[PDB]
Amino acid sequence: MDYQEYQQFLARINTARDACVAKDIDVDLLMARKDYFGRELCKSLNIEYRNDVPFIDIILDIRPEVDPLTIDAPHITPDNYLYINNVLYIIDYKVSVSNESSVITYDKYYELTRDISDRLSIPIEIVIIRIDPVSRDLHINSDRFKELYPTIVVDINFNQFFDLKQLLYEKFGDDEEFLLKVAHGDFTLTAPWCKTGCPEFWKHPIYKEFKMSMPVPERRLFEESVKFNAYESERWNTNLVKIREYTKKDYSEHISKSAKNIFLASGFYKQPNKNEISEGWTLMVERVQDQREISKSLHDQKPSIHFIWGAHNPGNSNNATFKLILLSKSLQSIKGISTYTEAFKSLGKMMDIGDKAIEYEEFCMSLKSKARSSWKQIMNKKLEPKQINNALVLWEQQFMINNDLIDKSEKLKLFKNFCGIGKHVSKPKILDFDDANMYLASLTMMEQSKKILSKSNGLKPDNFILNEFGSRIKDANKETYDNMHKIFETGYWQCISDFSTLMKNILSVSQYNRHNTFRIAMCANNNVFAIVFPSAATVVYSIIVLHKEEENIFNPGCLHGTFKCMNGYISISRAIRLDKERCQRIVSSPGLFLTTCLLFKHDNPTLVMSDIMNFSIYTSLSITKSVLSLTEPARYMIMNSLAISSNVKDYIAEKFSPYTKTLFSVYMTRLIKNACFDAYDQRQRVQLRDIYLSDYDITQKGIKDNRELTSIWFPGSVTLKEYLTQIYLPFYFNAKGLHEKHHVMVDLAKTILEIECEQRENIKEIWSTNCTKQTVNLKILIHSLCKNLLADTSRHNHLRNRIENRNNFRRSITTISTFTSSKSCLKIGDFRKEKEYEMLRNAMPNYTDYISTKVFDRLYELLDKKVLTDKPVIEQIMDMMIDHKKFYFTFFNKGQKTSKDREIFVGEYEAKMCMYAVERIAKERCKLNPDEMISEPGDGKLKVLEQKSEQEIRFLVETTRQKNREIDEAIEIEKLSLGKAKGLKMEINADMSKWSAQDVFYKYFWLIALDPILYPQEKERILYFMCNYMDKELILPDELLFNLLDQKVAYQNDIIATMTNQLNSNTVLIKRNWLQGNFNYTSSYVHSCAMSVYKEILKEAITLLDGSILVNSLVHSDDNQTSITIVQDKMENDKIIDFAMKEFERACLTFGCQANMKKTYVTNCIKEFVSLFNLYGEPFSIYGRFLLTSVGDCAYIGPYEDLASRISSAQTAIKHGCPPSLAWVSIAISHWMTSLTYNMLPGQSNDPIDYFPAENRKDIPIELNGVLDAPLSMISTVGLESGNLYFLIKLLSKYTPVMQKRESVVNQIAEVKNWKVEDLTDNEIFRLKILRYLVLDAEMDPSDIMGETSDMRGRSILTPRKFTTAGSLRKLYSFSKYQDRLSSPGGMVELFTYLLEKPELLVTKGEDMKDYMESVIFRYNSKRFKESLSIQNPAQLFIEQILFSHKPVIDFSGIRDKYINLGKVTFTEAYRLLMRDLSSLELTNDDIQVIYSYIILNDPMMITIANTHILSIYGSPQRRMGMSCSTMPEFRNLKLIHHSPALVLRAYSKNNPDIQGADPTEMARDLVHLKEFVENTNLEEKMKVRIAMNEAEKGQRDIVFELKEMTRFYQVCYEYVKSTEHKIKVFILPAKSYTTTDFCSLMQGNLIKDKEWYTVHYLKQILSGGHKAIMQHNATSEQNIAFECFKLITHFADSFIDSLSRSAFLQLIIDEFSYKDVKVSKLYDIIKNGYNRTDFIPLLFRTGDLRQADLDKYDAMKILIRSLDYLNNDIFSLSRIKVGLDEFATIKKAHFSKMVSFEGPPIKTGLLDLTELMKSQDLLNLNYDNIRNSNLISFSKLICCEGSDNINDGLEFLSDDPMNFTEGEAIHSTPIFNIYYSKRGERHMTYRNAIKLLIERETKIFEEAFTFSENGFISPENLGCLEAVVSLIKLLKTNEWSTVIDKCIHICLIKNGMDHMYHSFDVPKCFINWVMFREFINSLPGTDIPPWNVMTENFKKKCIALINSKF
RNA sequence: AACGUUAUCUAUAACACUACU
RNA sequence: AUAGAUAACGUU
Ligand SMILES: [Mg+2]
Ligand SMILES: [Zn+2]
């Protein structure tokens, strides 16, 4: 803070030019940070601030009476001291990331002060305060000091110092002397990881080819560089500098040529237009016709939607039996002849139950009841069909196939020709997407669908989502609620819901369907039925629709035929076969449909809901690859069309491959085709917003929001943000796993082998200068690598140690996560038995046998075979790099949502570890590189983009102004503007084609050869590794060989056979394709070096052009974002852009990369990078993806955790900028999906609303199948604790006393003991009982001082148990060993004893090979791990969870245990039993205290959230103008544990604080703290009692129970001992947030309303100083409230009040007002009797005081009161004072929006009441123009005349000093935009003058609005009319419109000087006769003045209504 | 499958819908 | 620089 110091340091940086003083200024910056932290800490702690006070001075201070010069005081200077309770404390402020400085300072101070403490007879306590800059976590060594001050609420931001340090580094980064000076140490290397190098590497054939490739000098340089040793040489850069100097000539020559190329460049770049697009489309259609088989028949189409629908019949019934009878009767009465009419009639006769409906119902209920009585399914009781009429009924809605009632030939025809059950090169058949007839048919189909579906439902729209979230959504936005109502009312919603429910029924009944039975499924609709035919898995079904009259059904091209029948027509759909995944997608479809509709329609009146519905119903239900082939390429086509420069034409001609098998696909293809042209047309209609820079931050930025762009998928006008949403969202409509393994595997192999062939036949040369494809310029690459390595190793000097520490190089193999997971891995060897396949090995000889096992099992096998050991991992990595000669790889399909899947490669363990080592080296190198982005954690790339955009905008504006100063001065001529400099902002968004396949691997070798921090032996070993790796062999998967060997017709041009010697071997040698994803960091790094070369080229070219350039290149892996800002005046921008693109391509090709010009594009402003956008400084993301993933897959273990998993996605959507109403929509959809999973919808069987005392499902807790209910900040912050938390806040608000109602949460939670339990309502009582007994433990006490937090306790209560099969588990070697141990006598008890001996292994990774083996063996005991190990189908789990809803699935024994002191139980019975049990329980005030203490008081985050909810106050709303990213601050600043939690647990397992890698004293402190926590929570005692009681109950030691209890104990300990986790969570907020309170305020204000956001401030200080698991019983202070109040008062008095009356006004407001319900006199008393008095010098001086000591302290911070009096005799400011002749002392500014928190008696000055001015909203702005252009309505609030004559005298009591006004200037750049900023206005513009102009203008307007009589306003008749109206308004009930009219007419009379008559106004004597009053008001000629007509007429209507209602 | 994350759960061991319609 | 399981996003 202290921004004055900020521009002081900025000026110092600007004037800085020497590296020898850069060190000094950096030290000064660090000292400034130190003293700023010290000042803030002292202010927080309410103590005096000192700075290095001498120790003798404090000795004298504490003991003045003792003589000096007798005890030798040490020369140490403590930062501060505190003497209380006869104890002295030494305080020092430290700002570091580690505690080394703190611990050494502690030791020194302690040792020095022991003797003084001994002699002075007073103990000395050393307190060291440490604050970590990146995360503001607090560290206090002394516990006694923490006891003295329980609450510490320090919260500050170091971002200013970080920015200044960044500026310093960028200003001096190139300076080598500066780099070596500021180095924190020297370059050192640890012991080499290996003792000997690899001598056989030099004879490797790959290295021979390498050597032959380079010319002789390069070979020599390489071979000496690989032998260079940094340790041996006197300088580590010697070889680097030598190589750089050698290559400097060639590098400079190439740079000079590339720069001088700019003149040759022409102005014709690759901008797209209609000609290119048309030619590309023609080429595309020609190519498609060549490849795909085009059809022109409508009958050849495939079903766009696998469904047919019809309206429901209200005339009929709804019972299931009646529906079945109606369906049978309809099927039995088919009229006409057709192919399958006889079969359908036979089916109708086949299920004819006759009139025996009751007997059939009895049978089905009996069977159902028998089934719903067992955990497992019933065996050995074979079912038998029962003959009811002519139907052999086997189960409810199931019918046996009776051959008697069906003809055999008809049966075979129906099953084969139609049903397809039982059946036995061409091209894919697609419809002509460009044929006019096909498009006409598509248009007709869509119009018919819209016509049928748009009809009203005819039924009430009541449903679960609306009922349970209407209030929340409507409060969020009324428009969204109305749109949802329109969605629900239409026929589209009914159709989609019926389809979903019917498809769910189909899925349910298809499980138990046999091969000779058929099922019937019904939905809510009485006309829609589904028939499910026998199956084997796949689901085969047909849809049947009964309708009164034909051609009235929704036919998405899937209707097989319509036939006449009784009471109308029956429509049969074609037989549909589907997979379970698509089945579940259809089931979940309604959520996707509703979300898509709401997202598309959100805030867009020009769009029509019908078109959005029509498009969404096809997008959501599209489960075919046809729409997949369209959604993906559309993004690139439309973006390139909108882009400034892109090669869209090629893309269309040789990439866009449409696959249109449906008419909807043709429609969407036409939509995309039109969108391309229309996007090219409208690219110039994008307009940027006006940047409101602040000279220290950028606010109100981004891109203007106006709808001019035509919408793509439907007619309408959309905003650019909405345009991007329409472009990008459809990609997320796709479904993953739509590829069939056969074809996708074949295509992946084809692509890989084709790339291999291309690289073998053509690519033979490695180094070239002409930029050959797949070639690298050697010289340039070497020079760039040398420069980048030098810079990186100069940045940090201990790189090798950091690499070893962070990547666990020293620790064991078992301590690395990636080596112990359960991912797939490959094993090679003689594995004949396990795989058994025989035909493959027999026919095909050369089979490199392989198997796919798990990583952890492979590691266990390797450890068992003694191949690997517990030695440091890196040594074993080197040993394996030498030993492992051969590498093998396999591949499979990722199953992504793209048109073509991305192949995924799996390698062996040895390759995994060696690649891990190399890639971690590269990653730790890249972490220092600013350009590298993978180093930045996830979601921080958005922040990087925002920072780059804002800094480049700043550079552009500054450079433009600086260059055009002279021209602007000359202007205030057209030729001068012509010759003035111009700006150009360009954004290149690029990706690289075939990043892994097409790459010169040799270029990485040099990156290792020139590496300094590697010893020559390590270099040799790594190079031998890569030489072996380039000889990798990819193994064809066994399935590919299976389906290739079973063709019987050889392929014409089989590349696989050619590479496999006609399938004679299953291994293919791959050389130049380093596998997909193996070397991300390495590749990325090299690309960053290439971007650095490009940056140098551009800078050199601009120097030749004599201009300014700023280039920012961001490189993730292959996706590159390059931003260029060029200011120059030589030639037009087109030549510059063409040159930039050409040289970008050249540089990208230089380093062996290849820019995908098809997907690479150029934009003026929009910067897309890894799916993150930055329109213009404004971050943006397509949050629709997270919204659509709300109904994704989940664990399906139980309702609560699935609700949690989907709320997770809802939260993630919120974090990306989703509006609150859409967030509620997503949450509601998630709740609906979870409810539908377990049949919990309202009215259904498992609906628990009836069984609980709840008005609606909101009252039921989440764990009891309730619904979420909390404000958005609650869910987004605490993560599902929001339910209980919000319930408790509601309780506090409802039941706390009025006096403490508005106090802090701590005061209320302490006063809770005074509640009357008899008042609580049942619902509340039930919820409190559930919290107290089901969640908490009864043994806890309200007097506890430390307790477990909600994070350390579970929440799930009801969890079904499924008797799942064991699985195969055969390939698992570790499983075989575990089974042998299990069969071994007494092995398990020995393993359990070992685990008890080291219990920390239960919750922490083992650090030893034996420990890892024991943990792996023990992990098999848990059935969950064994079940998860085998492959599973999420759809199968979902279906089984649906099916087992009614079976006893809840084990009530566990739920009973939770309360004091039979088998499985159903959900409904569980609810009944739980209510019966909780009825017997009881509550008391102590129980409520326990609940509140254990739920709220534990976590400081909970306290902060409760406070920010209770004390929130919302200010003036305003539209969201500029977004900005911000990370969430840590809510737990205090840290009680220092070591890592795993280390602390390891130490606590024993009692030895001294463990490996453990600091002794710090470890002892941590162990003491953990022991205190354990003994205070009684957790050890509770565990011991539990295990003892269980042992007594069983009679023998249930050892597994002991293991589980130990696991729970250590888990709770681990979660308590958690330090800061440094989670990276980014939120898009309307403003920048630095502190925690600012972040909370922005979050609260952003998530309340869609249209606008609010400014939120709190009545009291929300934060609380406490630890994670310690109850807090003390509130905070009020110092910050006083600070805010007095800052606001002083600044308001100075800015808006006349100087003469300022002191009197301040005295009065101190006298009687109060701020935030706190008397301002109390605040003045607090500030006066406080040590923070130097911040209020002017305020004190305006009341005298200051005791002559404040001046002394102020002088010490950087002089007599008598001087001050004369100096400030002139200056009348209340916040600004001048202590010296020029020295100025001021008070920090504050936002005026908090001013609403003031109240008191009115302050009447003249005709103005300043109290309303504080209470006002509009007139608090600082801009003169804003004040002068207000409305009379806002000013009207200030009118209090009581006998004034003129306006001027009353207005005299207003500030006459000139204020600031905002003015703007044009930027004159390629993207044209304005710049608005505030500056000091001249004298003639003041608050007085602004008020005068506003009042005169508004009074004239309102006067001419009320000139009723033609004579004039002052005419006697108009005066009489005004007297009449004032009499009327005074007599009748006061109205706000009446008051504003009265004030306006009164001020008009004041302006005309008629007030004396105004105060003489009365009821006219010529007029209580109300009838003639009505006559007169009805006679009033309401004028049509555009501003005033509305209020006048509304006033007239209100008055006439009131007078009518009066009588 | 590698990565970069983010958030959720931590048990000893033959049948759904059947609806405001 | 928790483990296990699951899910989602982005890159390869
Ligand atoms: Mg990209
Ligand atoms: Zn008056």
Numbering used by the authors: 1 to 424, 437 to 548, 555 to 854, 893 to 1028, 1042 to 1530, 1544 to 1840, 1982 to 2190, 2199 to 2238
Can you quote the paper on this entry?
Segmented negative-strand RNA bunyaviruses encode a multi-functional polymerase that performs genome replication and transcription. Here, we establish conditions for in vitro activity of La Crosse virus polymerase and visualize its conformational dynamics by cryo-electron microscopy, unveiling the precise molecular mechanics underlying its essential activities. Replication initiation is performed de novo, in the absence of primer. Concerning transcription, LACV-L catalyses its initiation through a cap-snatching mechanism, whereby LACV-L steals cellular capped mRNA, binds them through its cap-binding domain (CBD), cleaves them 9 to 17 nucleotides downstream the cap with its endonuclease domain (ENDO), before using them as a primer for transcription initiation.
For the late-elongation state, a 5′-1-17BPm, 3′-vRNA-1-30 and four nucleotides were used. In this state, the 3′-vRNA is entirely replicated, a 10-base pair template-product duplex is visible in the active site and the 3′-vRNA end, following its exit from the active site as a single-stranded RNA, binds in the polymerase 3′-end secondary binding site. At late-elongation stage, the exit of the 3′ template from the template exit channel is coordinated with a repositioning of the vRBL and the clamp close to the core resulting in the formation of the 3′ secondary binding site as in pre-initiation.
